[PDB]
Ligand binder design. Structure first.
Ligand code: SF4
Ligand code: SF4
Ligand code: FES
Ligand code: FES
Ligand SMILES: [Fe+2]
Ligand SMILES: [Fe+2]
Lengths: 635, 635
């Protein structure tokens, strides 16, 4: 098998050869077994919203042409998309809610393993929300902030403040005029599920406006999740680490944190340091915590924990034979890990009541007992390391250097070395003079349909040569880090002269003797909210709305319902938004036209659906350059 | 075409012949055009929860055997079912929320068309919730009740009170021990959507326990909806009216209220009386308001408005040519009505922001302007009546007599004529002595897959001959009313001797000179909560839990996601629950076994999946008789 048709990651290719030798089925094998996939589902022309279904509609030809209840193709496609947006929002609802409850418990004395680590961020959030700080104890300000977070999940006398207080007033006014501001996060999720149920909303424009509103409930949960995680665990600052399977160490207890929530992984990191002698008594050098997916990004950004792998290739970390434990909370975990564990020795451990996998070991993890729960979990890992005394392992000797930790606060601080009292101005100056053509955010998943990382790297290379400032989160950041895009040594090879000049000027002012890295890692998927904060701050400084800025987004290999919600709120806040896999919309030309064209007249953003990455890069550059022209700039 | 293969309703058959002559496509034609339907969807073996899909699994044979991410058949089936339960709960969330906001506005002086009509019910609800009434103004008690209703949608320091205060403590304890009490209505909906999204919950038992909990959030919304509608519009008492298409009148302005919420239909009823002279000036005898679906049930139960038709046959009311307006809010409205209106003359009017249909006229309906909005709507209806001056219409001369209005309060009052201070005892006495074998609730929809009404009438006939007390709601009540099961003149033909003796004794004590009807109509689908209140009161009076009572439920022709949620909470509160159409579970034997067997060990209820109605009746009788035996009674 030509493994570069499956992944462009050479460590993943090596593990794919090992999996094939050993007869271990992978995600790529399960994909091949699924082909050809159902074209009704691929196009969006299938509905199972009642027990008269399944209903399908032929994309072309003869009957069936309409659902049994009379639902048209437009209605069926829009309802399916809306449910995907609601499901993404629900994942960020649970994540943010988790952190809100943890902060509340911490300041009520009920969870002593947690505390206010970033007091400055706590006070700035309180100020943004309108919560008074003068004369108040930190623990009382934090209680108020946690209560406000919980209140945004339901209707109240204000709209969702993690929308209205984080976008410029001009953008809030545009959205309010179209009825798009969410009333409550879980309120919107429930209204979507209602209006898309049988015999309810059946007008594509009305349905899609509901979808835009629910996508802003997802943005709110992301921004809430970042705000709360920064309070509890610290705002990221620049860090240096490594990525790819070579960060595993045959002689250590290798423990992957995988899933999403730092409430769990951050404690694993600190406890693992305390249990080092306990690990050495078992014959290991220590506990080697490594990251997979977003929770790996969280501990990479805050602590420099090296990233082992991401998304589609997560099983490969197990195939090395050296992964002693995989510690899970929720989201983006292939349930195949539980069965592969049987073959690879790995102990897969779930920790959250609503996210169990048959055949995994479950260790309930309560914030009230976090340290005790973490020691129980890590002792299972040490037990597993001892069982592989004497077995060979195959860890590919492949890793990259990763400079990361570029929270919005960190970026503003780095820029402030060039202009202390007007930190955004050096960035804007270089946009205006052409040294920075625009900004592109790469975000979202890998997807087995796309050779892993190929779209992220192909599009990133073309944009960097054209002097685009590239930022990245989630498994987009994972794709770019595993291919060297976060190593400043690659600036000369990857970047246009103008962008290199800017990256070098900023880095030298930060005492680096070298540039910032080619791509700025802004964190996890909830940390797409950080990109929003940066873009909104640039909008505010310029006095224009986000739909006038030369800023675009690319979910180049999207997979999860969260990525659909992300793409939709990127459009709703005003960005040209590329998606590099087909969402289930092509069976309705009216819906496609709304999402790629007429929504421009509502929010100023729009989707760019393009599966060829070189063409996608051209289209993203055209969108950036159209925004430049609209500001009167050369391009 | 043999129209009795489509519907057992003879008025519907006549309209099917008219539709065929005129070339108007119906729901049955769209069903035929859909056959054969997709077997992956029929069995539940399809997943579209991420953009790597669609994934399918062959029920038998070779690959594909597992989803791309590793999701097994058990996980895929359970996740799809859970989303259907969440969607049903969301429909009842929106309905109940609507009423809560209306009550709040009414007592805040913001909606003068609405008021506290049932002060006794207001005070009993407040007492059940723990809200003090002594020394308080009604408007303040009502504000507190509305605030408590809204609070149950989100997490707080108590669980959902419209669950914990409406079931016996012993049942609440059983549910709490299994972690099944909902924390908040919209909270549970969002948690379902999260845990069923890609890479989250992947254990069938864990997923299904989440589904049971979310089904109790649906029960809460139903019970909240009934409680609030009774406060605002009056608790039903016995009423006499008629049903079927013959209630339309060629010489009147015929206006159907269709959908769910009495906030709209109840005002239509009162305003239509005030506009009678305005209608006579246009040449009509008056405005003839008729009911379709649940909102028709609501105004039938409270005002005796005749029911025109239900569920699957709703288009047929338009085919008569005499339907001048169809006034819609949300749920169970076939969107085909908007296109059929073009051919039939009918003015289809939507009124709710989240439920529009392309091609219908939209008239926003604000509770603050209810009377003004209703007059605008009814004036469109009068305009339409005038346009059919001189056209022939074909109204089948087919109707039945319907005695209805059996709220739980009404049933208790009727029984109190036999035992004033212990009203449930005469019912229990007749259960014990065999005159009443048990109780069966028929509920839920019609479904185009089943000849309309055939399962409801076939099963009801067999149970009535075996002396089962039969109660009904929703389109189950609609099916039974359109076939004469709500006419006391049919008691001798339909009922066993024991049941006839009881129905006659109760009716004679109520001054009727005749029995109660063969089937007691307990109202709309939210009014399945009334059946809960009756059964819980019987449990309390006997000192046993609901899973010991000889009470069963039958969703004999289920369709909507709401009906899946209903069947699941009937199981969760302890009832043997028949479903007469295949839910998408047969592709997983483990899930089927949980839902039909091992859940007995958790909640004491269980599903009975049986598509043959004579066999279903036997199985329901066996379940009733097993409960009789468990109480030591003859059967
Ligand atoms: S909602 Fe309409 S289109 Fe969807 S399954 Fe039911 S009948 Fe078919
Ligand atoms: S969640 Fe798993 S099973 Fe479902 S579509 Fe995605 S890959 Fe397939
Ligand atoms: S027909 Fe294949 S996704 Fe439904
Ligand atoms: S394959 Fe037909 S419902 Fe998906
Ligand atoms: Fe993620
Ligand atoms: Fe209904």
């Amino acid at each position: 098998a030509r493994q570069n048709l499956k992944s462009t990651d050479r460590a993943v290719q090596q593990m794919l050869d090992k999996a094939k030798r050993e007869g271990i089925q992978t995600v790529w094998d399960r994909y091949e077994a699924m082909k050809p996939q159902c074209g009704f589902g691929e196009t969006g022309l299938c509905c199972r919203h009642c027990l008269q279904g399944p209903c399908r509609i032929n994309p072309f030809g003869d009957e069936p042409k309409v659902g049994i209840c009379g639902a048209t193709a437009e209605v069926i496609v829009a309802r399916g998309l809306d449910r995907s947006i609601a499901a993404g929002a629900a994942g960020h609802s649970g994540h943010a809610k988790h952190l809100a409850h943890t902060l509340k418990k911490a300041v009520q004395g009920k969870a002593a393993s947690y505390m206010i680590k970033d007091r400055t961020k706590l006070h700035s959030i309180a100020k943004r929300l309108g919560i008074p700080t003068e004369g108040q104890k930190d623990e009382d300000i934090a209680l108020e902030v946690a209560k406000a977070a919980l209140a945004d999940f339901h209707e109240k006398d204000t709209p969702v403040l993690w929308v209205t207080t984080v976008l410029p007033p001009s953008r809030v006014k545009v959205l309010s005029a179209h009825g798009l501001i969410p009333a409550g996060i879980d309120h919107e999720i429930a209204e979507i599920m209602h209006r898309t149920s049988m015999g309810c909303d059946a007008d594509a424009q009305n349905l899609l406006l509901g979808g835009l509103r629910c996508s802003l409930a997802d943005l709110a949960g992301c921004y809430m999740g970042t705000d709360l995680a920064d309070i509890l665990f610290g705002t990221p600052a620049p860090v240096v680490t490594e990525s790819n399977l070579g960060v595993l160490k045959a002689d250590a207890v290798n423990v992957a944190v995988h899933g999403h929530n730092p409430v769990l992984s951050d404690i694993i990191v600190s406890v693992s340091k305390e249990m080092e002698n306990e690990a050495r008594a078992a014959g290991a050098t220590g506990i080697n915590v490594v990251g997979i997916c977003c929770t790996g990004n969280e501990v990479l950004m805050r602590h420099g924990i090296p990233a082992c792998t991401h998304s589609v290739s997560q099983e490969m970390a197990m195939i090395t034979g050296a992964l002693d434990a995989m510690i899970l909370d929720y989201q983006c975990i292939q349930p195949s890990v539980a069965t592969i564990a049987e073959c690879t020795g790995t102990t897969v451990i779930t920790t959250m009541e609503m996210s169990k996998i048959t055949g995994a070991t479950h260790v309930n993890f309560a914030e009230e007992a976090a340290v005790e729960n973490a020691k129980q979990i890590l002792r299972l890992a040490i037990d597993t390391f001892k069982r592989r005394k004497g077995k060979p392992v195959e860890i590919p000797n492949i890793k990259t250097k990763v400079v990361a930790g570029f929270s919005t606060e960190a970026i503003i601080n780095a820029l402030s070395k060039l202009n202390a009292n007007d930190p955004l101005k050096p960035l804007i100056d270089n946009v205006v003079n052409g040294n920075i053509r625009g900004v592109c955010l790469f975000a979202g998943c890998n997807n087995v349909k796309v050779p892993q990382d190929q779209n992220f790297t192909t599009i990133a290379r073309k944009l960097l040569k054209q002097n685009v400032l590239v930022v990245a989160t989630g498994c987009g950041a994972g794709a770019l880090m595993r291919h060297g895009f976060m190593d400043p040594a690659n600036v000369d090879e990857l970047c246009g002269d103008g962008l290199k000049a800017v990256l070098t000027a900023i880095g030298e002012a930060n005492g680096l003797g070298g540039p910032l890295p080619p791509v700025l890692h802004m964190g996890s998927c909830v940390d797409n909210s950080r990109a929003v904060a940066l873009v909104a701050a640039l909008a505010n400084r310029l006095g224009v709305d986000l739909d006038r800025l030369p800023v675009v987004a690319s979910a180049a290999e999207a997979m999860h319902e969260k990525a659909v919600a992300l793409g939709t709120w990127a459009v709703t806040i005003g960005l040209p938004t590329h998606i590099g896999v087909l969402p289930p919309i092509t069976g309705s030309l009216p819906v496609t036209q709304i999402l790629t064209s007429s929504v421009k007249d509502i929010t100023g953003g729009y989707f760019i659906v393009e599966l060829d990455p070189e063409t996608a890069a051209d289209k993203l550059l055209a969108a950036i350059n159209e925004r430049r022209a609209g500001l009167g700039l050369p391009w």
